[PDB]
């Protein structure tokens, strides 16, 4: 069976309880994870150890908090006490875990399921071929020996409009924002990088990225996490918002793909 789970955020106990509820069995089942495995919850170290141990039975995409952890580890960014990353950063296997993490994809595609996953979704300004190329470019910098330079360049809120003519730092920053920070778009599809509210609370003319018809969403289902204020509700058919805010005292959500059945684990916080 195929299971998709939203942002874990170090909530290891809830993740394990949810997987026991569906009797997840590596080798018979596959788990898809929307990213943001780490930070806020207490068990980021255990989460990374477990997910890494899954090998081919897990399909991960990296989120913005996974990339922030990599930036802290590389000395690029400052550790925020509320993220609770210190046990992971100080672990004797930290290098092994984080060098594995930086090699993971930003985008997962399954053609037989017609299913696409990324942390924040797929910007309506991209077709599938462009999304694939952009993911490959950023994954290449992340998996290279020079990844701290990329991580440093990645911070920024501009440019917020895609063009195939984008080059260099701006191209990389847009790609990273689109895959890992996107929520709202302007009507032309341009990213807004400030509003984190629910769609009902947003100021006009902002609309959710999934309310703007895009070529990927017309041919594929899209699963994503990231947007906790959405509470997993209000999406069109074929759009699956899996982040129900476990680290925030909400819930951890698992979707079984074969029958679209939902399973929920309440937060222990
Ligand atoms: C950056 O954090 P991230 O990438 O983990 O994404 P995130 O959606 O979990 O957090 C971004 C912000 O959204 C806020 N938020 C979380 N749940 C909310 C809700 N139910 N209603 C309104 N606001 C909410 C949080 O306080 C947080 O500061
Ligand atoms: Mn998150
Ligand atoms: Mn996120």
Swiss-Prot record:
It catalyses: P(1),P(4)-bis(5'-adenosyl) tetraphosphate + H2O = 2 ADP + 2 H(+). Monomer. CDD domains: MPP_ApaH (cd07422). Belongs to the Ap4A hydrolase family. One of its GO terms (cellular component) is cytoplasm. Hydrolyzes diadenosine 5',5'''-P1,P4-tetraphosphate to yield ADP. It is an enzyme of class 3 (hydrolase). It holds the Pfam family Metallophos. The keyword Hydrolase applies. The keyword DNA damage does not apply. GO terms for molecular function: bis(5'-nucleosyl)-tetraphosphatase (symmetrical) activity; bis(5'-nucleosyl)-tetraphosphatase activity; hydrolase activity; phosphatase activity. Co(2+) is a strong stimulator (100-fold increase in rate of hydrolysis). Mn(2+), Cd(2+), Ni(2+), Mg(2+) and Ca(2+) are weak stimulators; the two latter act synergistically with Co(2+). It comes from Escherichia coli (strain K12). Its EC number is 3.6.1.41. Keywords: Hydrolase. InterPro entries: ApaH, Calcineurin-like_PHP_ApaH, Metallo-depent_PP-like. One of its GO terms (biological process) is RNA decapping. This is Bis(5'-nucleosyl)-tetraphosphatase [symmetrical].
């Amino acid at each position: 069976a195929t299971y998709l789970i939203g942002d874990v955020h170090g909530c290891y106990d809830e993740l394990i309880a949810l997987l026991h509820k569906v009797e997840f069995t590596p080798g018979k089942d596959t788990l898809w994870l929307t990213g943001d495995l780490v930070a806020r919850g207490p068990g980021s170290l255990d989460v990374l150890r477990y997910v890494k141990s899954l090998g081919d039975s897990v399909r991960l995409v990296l989120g913005n908090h996974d990339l922030h952890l990599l930036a802290v580890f590389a000395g690029i960014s400052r550790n925020k006490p509320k993220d609770r990353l210190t046990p992971l950063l100080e672990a004797p296997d930290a290098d092994e875990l984080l060098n594995w993490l930086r090699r993971q994809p930003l985008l997962q595609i399954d053609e037989e399921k017609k299913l696409v996953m990324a942390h924040a979704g797929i910007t309506p300004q991209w077709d599938l071929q462009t999304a694939k190329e952009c993911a490959r470019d950023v994954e290449a910098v992340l998996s290279s020996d020079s990844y701290p330079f990329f991580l440093d360049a990645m911070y920024g809120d501009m440019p917020n409009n895609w063009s195939p003519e984008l080059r260099g730092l701006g191209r990389l920053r847009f790609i990273t924002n689109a895959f890992t920070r996107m929520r709202f778009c302007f009507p032309n599809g341009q990213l807004d990088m400030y509003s984190k509210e629910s769609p009902e609370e947003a100021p006009a003319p902002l609309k959710p990225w999934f309310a703007i018809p895009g070529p990927v969403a017309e041919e594929y289902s899209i699963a994503f996490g990231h947007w906790a204020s959405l509470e997993g509700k209000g999406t069109p058919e074929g759009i699956y918002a899996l982040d129900t805010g476990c680290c925030w005292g909400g819930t951890l959500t698992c979707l079984r793909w074969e029958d679209k059945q939902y399973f929920v684990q309440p937060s222990n916080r």
